[PDB]
Amino acid sequence: MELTEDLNMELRVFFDTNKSNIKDQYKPEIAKVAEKLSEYPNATARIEGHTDNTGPRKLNERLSLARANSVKSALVNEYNVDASRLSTQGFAWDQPIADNKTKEGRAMNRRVFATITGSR
Amino acid sequence: MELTEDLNMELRVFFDTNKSNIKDQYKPEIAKVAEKLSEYPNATARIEGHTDNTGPRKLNERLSLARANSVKSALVNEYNVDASRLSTQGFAWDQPIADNKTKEGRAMNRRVFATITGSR
């Protein structure tokens, strides 16, 4: 029989200003990502971090990547997910999803989006 | 978080001449379909029956739809799958997959192919 199941997941984690820690409220989502990475052992994740547009370019290059790395670290260190399955990249403020002129637009931009894909 | 798992399954059942019963051979495969239909309660199945090109045309129109319906009935009656999730259609000898000039090709054409798709 031909039978396949395809996984597609998207995780969104948000961060406070200048912070790259994972807030406790995001732990259940990371745990679910880890469960699906075990259920689909060929799956991989592309984790992309971002900043709002405030502060030096240099801070935000590092901060965007640190936030992606924080997501990867939680998976690797707390869920024993192999690191090589998880890519990380930071886009500093280059890819806004909301208006940087509002406190709430800035909150939306301070984020990691991770895309998990696999098949079994 | 957004999580989707997409199911794609293809079932092939074959028939003896002038018959629309499910041969015991096919029962494990039909059981597997029902299992996935339960694991993906939103999935539906497109069930299509066929004949070889021997015999009167209306006999083959009926028999092709009877084949598709025998697969549906196995799912509905033995495995309690909701009948509205399953479509059936017969194509008489109009869609051959093999040579009707040989016994082996005719046996290939006496079939039901079903595609089961959906997400959870």
Curated annotation (Swiss-Prot), chains A, B:
One of its GO terms (biological process) is monoatomic ion transport. GO terms for cellular component: cell outer membrane; host cell mitochondrion; pore complex. Residues 2-120 form the OmpA-like domain. Meso-2,6-diaminopimelate binds at residues 18, 52, 54, 60, 67. GO terms for molecular function: porin activity. It is found in: Cell outer membrane; Host mitochondrion. Its main location: membrane. Changing residue 52 to A: Periplasmic domain no longer binds diaminopimelate. Transmembrane segments: none annotated. It comes from the Bacteria. Belongs to the outer membrane OOP (TC 1.B.6) superfamily. Homotrimer. Forms a pore with a size of 1.3 nm. Functions as a porin. Induces apoptosis in human cell lines through caspase-dependent and AIF-dependent pathways. Purified Omp38 enters host cell and localizes to the mitochondria, which presumably leads to a release of proapoptotic molecules such as cytochrome c and AIF (apoptosis-inducing factor). Binds peptidoglycan, contributes to cell wall maintenance. Live A.baumannii and purified Omp38 elicit identical effects with respect to the induction of apoptosis in human cell lines. The periplasmic domain (residues 221-339) binds peptidoglycan (PGN) and diaminopimelate, one of the components of PGN. This is Outer membrane protein Omp38. It comes from Acinetobacter baumannii (strain ATCC 19606 / DSM 30007 / JCM 6841 / CCUG 19606 / CIP 70.34 / NBRC 109757 / NCIMB 12457 / NCTC 12156 / 81). The gene is omp38. The chain holds residues 221 to 339 of 356 of the full protein.
